[model samples]
Target: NPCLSESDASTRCLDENNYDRERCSTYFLRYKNCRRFWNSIVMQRRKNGVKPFMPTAAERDEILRAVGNMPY
Candidate 1:
């Protein structure tokens, strides 16, 4: 469920904005950045032969600070 909140916020933004994509760019990018970030982490962890290739709590906060500080 990583980045699910961002996804939902983007959806809500789009819904309320009547598909006004320009206005929703920040929201969309938040999800986009998160997806890419999580994917990289998962891929790296899998390559490292770690259990539960998904990111744990330590990796979880990385994106939070990134997107939280990002303009949105």
Candidate 2:
């Protein structure tokens, strides 16, 4: 349930907007912020050699797709 709050709200917003990105941009951005926060935590854990929780390929791809930074 990564980005649980924002993800759920964004998904609801997308559904409410009939999947229109323009209309869902706000919610999407919120989700992205949440994702960025968690990604930073993951990176920090890795830097500390903590064996951080890794995101699935799909999750990584989706986040990358949103920010235009893929191929991780």
Candidate 3:
């Protein structure tokens, strides 16, 4: 439910069932960058005395790129 997957615990769900290395490799790339992006943005904002909730896509990516490493 609240999880990123479509399944809700031990229930049958196909939302994210299609996840596979080949199929999701791109996803993994994007996810890794996205996570780094957010983390950097959060830290930057905090240092700047700015409280941010949801950051803009550009802002997030900038932060992620600032730090290195993909989602994986």
Question: Would you estimate the TM-scores of all the predictions?
Answer: 0.59, 0.51, 0.40
Task: Extract clashing residue pairs from model 2.
Answer: none
> For model 1, what is the error of residue 55's alpha carbon versus the real structure, in angstroms, after optimal superposition?
2.2
The TM-score measured for candidate 3 stands at 0.40
Candidate 2 — number of clashing residue pairs?
A: 0
Q: Write the per-residue lDDT of candidate 3 for residues 1-72, one digit (tens) a residue.
A: 022222232133224555345544554455555566556656667776755645676865765586565433
Predicted candidate 1 versus true structure: per-residue lDDT over 1-72, tens digit per residue: 346776777778788878887887876677777677777767877887858977678656775576676422
User: Whose lDDT is higher: candidate 1's or candidate 2's?
Assistant: 1
Question: Considering summed lDDT, which 10 consecutive residues are worst modelled in model 3?
Answer: 1-10
In model 1, which residue pairs have backbone atoms overlapping below 3 Å?
A: none
Of 2 and 3, the candidate ahead on TM-score is 2
Task: Score each candidate by Cα lDDT.
Answer: 0.70, 0.64, 0.50
Please give, for residues 1-72, the per-residue lDDT of candidate 2 as tens digits. 256665777778778777877876776676677667667747855776755356567756676677684221
Tell me model 2's lDDT, rounded to 2 decimals: 0.64
Q: Model 3 shows how many backbone clashes?
A: 2
Can you give the lDDT of residue 32 in candidate 2?
72
**Candidate 1 versus the native: TM-score?**
0.59
Better of 2 and 3 by lDDT: 2
Clashes of each: 0, 0, 2
